[PDB]
Structure formats: C-alpha cells, structure tokens
C-alpha cells in the first residue's frame, strides 16, 4: 500500500508578526513538496527529484491553494481564540492532517482529514467519510456547522478522487526513488566495559524504507535479557540507520546472533562477533 | 499541554578520524514547535546549523533534523544543545560513536 499525506501547521506569533504557516507533503514517508509562509515570495517548492517535472501551472495553482488555506487558518485561529476564551497575547497552534492510504491496486483503504488544537485532538473525519468526531465542547459547534455546510462530502470527494489519482501519477513519475529498495550494510561492534562484561552493538545503516526488524538471539531463542535498541533515524540523504545493543559475558560473544530483516533483502541477515 | 523533546546526536556515515562527515541532531516528539537547536564544537556554537522541515507525526508532536559538516577527531568533542519550553534547563547531549 501507499499513502499521500499533507501536514499543515499554523502557529500564531503575537508580538513577533504574522502567524507561521507551513505545508509539507509526503508520499509514503518521503517529503516532496514544501510551503513556508514567512519565507520571501511564499511559493510551493520541490523537495524531491521526480516532482520537478511539473509545469509552472502546477506550482501556480498549488501556491494559490496554499495561500487560500493560509488565510483560512488565520481566521480559524482567531475563531478558536474566541471559542476557548483565551488570551490574545498567547501563541497557539493549529495542526491539520489530510491524505489517503490506498492499496497497491487502486482502492482507497483510509481517508484522513483531522485537526488538532495546541497538541490535543480537536476534530476528525471518520473512516466512513461522512460523520465527524468532535472531542471538545467547542469542537461540537464546528461539527454542527460543518454538517450544515456539508464539508464531509467535498472532503470525501477530494480524498476518493483527486488524492488517489495524483498518488498514482506520483508513483508512476517517481518510480525511480519511491520504489527503490536499498539493502542495509550491517556489522557488529564489540566494546569491553569497565564492569567486566562486553557490549555488543548490531548496526544496520543505509537502508530504504525505514521498515526494518533488528533483534538479537542467544542460542536461537528469543533471548531473556536487557536488550536496548534505539528508534529508526534518518541519515540526511534518504536512508536510515538502526542499532541494537546487548550486554554479554566475556567469552560467550560467539553465542549471540544479530538478525536483521529488511524488505529489500533476499534472506534475513545473521551476524556473529 | 507541552511535550518534552527527545534528542539523538549521530554521524551520517561510519565515523573515522580525519574523514569529513555530517553530524546531525534528530529532535522528535515535542510541543509547541518553537525550539532552538545549537551544534557545539568544544563548547562553541557552530553557525552552520542547517535544519530540515519542522514536520509532525500522527501523535501531533513535531520533529526536526539539524545537520552540519564536521571532521571527527579524538580531541574535538561535539554536542547538540536544545532549548525548548518544557525543560527548565537546556539539554546538552554529546556525540558518541556508539
């Protein structure tokens, strides 16, 4: 499956200037378009390689839509400041998630269209793409008025139509960098410790996508000891890294096997010290 | 109504002394999105802190990546200082070739 996702942040900056408006676009997990309101001549810039082949009309209409949504978020921020009976001198944030997760064939499996205020869930469009879930007492006024206007219908029309076909076009145009599978270079590092035991470190570097499984095994068993592994991080070039540690006795480091399984690998890699 | 940030300082390519490398600070899961990230060499602030898109995850917490060019030596210590709102005192995390 693949997803087209758009993340929007509107942050009021009282005493500083106009609120910052940001719009980032992701295919699966790779960013490809970006818009920032406080930069000079705010326009839609490319962030990938395969999206640069869009005509000036593409960027023109996307910038028009971005600025319209920016004004919409301005008035939304003011209306929320009135809704919650808050101070005009504070800085508050609206966050908007919108997109479509679609199976690898051509059927929309999930349409996302949700808003959060100051980090807490404000409103959401349920998977049915018809009913709104409103968490706050003030969010229910939004739900009622949006049922009156019928925003769910046009939002579903977007999600079920424009989102999926533009995801198809992006996948066909970016099949070079969006469908690639780079296997990870893996190795094990052995550091003695001032205690008396040894820290083994399994590394998986330079892979795509971020979906990877990294585990240690004792004697082919699921292992029964304090295993410390960190979260998948980007490298700053399109790939990711990961590592998993284990504290082992002096002399039994040859009993431990690190297993790394990636979607770009023919067989799960097993490494010993 | 605030979330404390999480910091990971690391090198892009396997680090070795004298070889040029990119050191980056990956700061995730914080709120509000107004933070400052400084890269420190031997205590001094590097000015080449080019940072990436201040995006956010499904949990609505923001993340960011700030990288800089450097050359790892056995005498230079490198770190990342983050100043948010949720931490009473700024968090400094030193780079370490794990």
């Amino acid at each position, epitope marked *: 499956s693949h997803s087209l996702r758009y993340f929007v942040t509107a942050v009021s*900056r009282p005493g*500083f200037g106009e609120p910052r408006y940001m719009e980032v676009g992701y295919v699966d997990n790779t960013e490809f378009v970006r818009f920032d309101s406080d930069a000079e001549n705010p326009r839609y810039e490319p962030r990938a390689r395969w999206i640069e082949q869009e005509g000036p009309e593409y960027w023109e209409r996307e910038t028009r839509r971005a600025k319209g949504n920016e004004q919409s978020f301005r008035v939304d921020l003011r209306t929320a400041l009135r809704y919650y009976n808050q101070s005009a001198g504070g800085s508050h944030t609206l966050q908007w998630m919108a997109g479509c997760d679609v199976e690898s064939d051509g059927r929309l499996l999930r349409g996302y269209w949700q808003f959060a205020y100051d980090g807490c869930d404000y409103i959401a469009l349920n998977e049915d793409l018809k009913t709104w879930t409103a968490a706050d007492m003030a969010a229910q006024i939004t739900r009622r008025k949006w049922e009156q206007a019928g925003a769910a219908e046009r939002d579903r029309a977007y999600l079920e139509g424009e989102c999926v076909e533009w995801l198809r076009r992006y996948l066909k145009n970016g099949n070079a960098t969006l469908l690639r599978t780079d296997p990870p270079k893996a190795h094990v590092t052995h550091h003695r410790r001032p205690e008396g035991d040894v820290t083994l470190r399994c590394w998986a570097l330079g892979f795509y996508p971020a979906d990877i499984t990294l585990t240690w095994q004792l004697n082919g068993e699921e292992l029964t000891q304090e295993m410390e592994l960190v979260e998948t991080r980007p490298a700053g070039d399109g790939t990711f890294q990961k590592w998993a540690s284990v504290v082992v006795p002096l002399g039994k480091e040859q009993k431990y096997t690190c297993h790394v399984e990636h979607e770009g690998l023919p067989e799960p890699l097993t490494l010993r010290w | 109504i605030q979330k404390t940030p999480q910091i990971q300082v690391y090198s892009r390519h396997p680090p070795e002394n004298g070889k040029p490398n990119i050191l980056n600070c990956y700061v995730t899961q914080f709120h509000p999105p107004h933070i400052e990230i400084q890269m420190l060499k031997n205590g001094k602030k590097i000015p080449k802190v080019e940072m990436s898109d201040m995006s956010f995850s499904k949990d609505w917490s923001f993340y960011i990546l700030a990288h800089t060019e450097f050359t790892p030596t056995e005498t230079d210590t490198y770190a990342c200082r983050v100043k948010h709102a949720s931490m009473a005192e700024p968090k400094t995390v030193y780079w370490d070739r794990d």
Partner: antibody
Amino acid sequence: QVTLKESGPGMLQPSKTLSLTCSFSGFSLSTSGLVVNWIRQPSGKSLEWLAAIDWDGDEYYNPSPKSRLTVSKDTSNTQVFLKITSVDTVDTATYYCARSRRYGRYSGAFDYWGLGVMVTVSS
Amino acid sequence: DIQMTQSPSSMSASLGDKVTINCLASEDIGNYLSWYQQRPGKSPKLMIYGVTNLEDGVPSRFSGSRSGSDYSLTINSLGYDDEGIYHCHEYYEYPFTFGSGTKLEIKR
C-alpha cells in the same frame, strides 16, 4: 495581569554596585517561553537595551558596557535581578524591565513594561 | 550593533492631521521591527509588532508600513491623547538597537 514592578535604590555614589530587581505577577520564568530584558533610558536621550535573561537561565548582554553587567534569575520564577559593578555618573537614568517571548532563536518585541525606577549617581 | 536612525526628531501637527514617522536600519531588519509609544511621564507601551500588526487594544487609526529598508508609522485622526514620544525596535541581531525617539505635540 502581567504587571511587573521595578525596585532599586535611587541615589548611589560612584564606583559602587547597583542592584535592581524586577518582580512580575502574571507569568513565570518556569516551563514558560517568556524572557525578561532590562532597558535603561537617560532622561532626555534614547532608550538603551542592557541585558536579557531567558527562562532557561541563559543570559544575553549588550557588549557596549564592557563587562560590568550581570543579570540573574531567582530559584523561584517570580523575580529577575540586574547587577552593575563600578557604577558611573553617566549611568543616571530610569530603568525598566520588559517581557518578550522566545520564538525559536529570536526574541519578539516587548509586550508589557514595568513602571520604571529612577537611579541617579553623584558624589 | 545595527544602529537604527529615526526621523524626524520632533513633529508638530494640528488636530485630526495625518502624520508619519520614519525609521532606518543600517542592515536588513526584515519584519523584525516594532513601534512603542510612551506618554508624558509614563513607561513605553507596545503599539505595533511585526511591522504592520497592531497589538490588541490599539486604536485602528494607527498603521505601520515598510518600504525597502525604511519603516514608517502613520496616524491619520490625531487627537490630544497621542502626544508623547515614539520609539523603534530592532529585535533581530542581539544588540537590540532603538530609534532616537520622536516627540509628537499638537500645534497652536
């Protein structure tokens, strides 16, 4: 409410040490993005920014007064102190403390100002 | 320091007249400038932040503009309530430089 008040001794002799305090009741330099900055104005002249202190504890100074300034906060986020060593007759002025908000890396205008404390230096 | 020069040094207008106060920065202070008003015998209160944003509570007759590197603050329906001293701000480089200050009185 905000309301911040300057407190400090007027009429100081030269070459002594001036100690001002700013007390605010509306915000806290705790887990808050607010910063407090000291400003001074000699009567009949232009405003001069002296120092500033973030809620972290990080301090910023104006390099123009060589190295005689030191600004510091309380262990209880409710006051901010400024100390000027080797005070001169040229430092006679009215001193204010103002609030600003930290937006990433930059400060952003002074929302509320104190009332001002008049200090005069003469032998 | 990014010393900022404010001009004119002193202005005098009739009741209801529109007046403009200018401020220049030696370096590029893009939208990092605010205008403060100080009444006679009072502390400077903040008036305009950003460059064209009036702080909540400021009468709408005030306006803030920018033309290249010179910032202007205009006021059209002047009344006796606005005589005082006005100041520019800089909050960009850390040595925050102020304007020289402009005095606004009413003619007679």
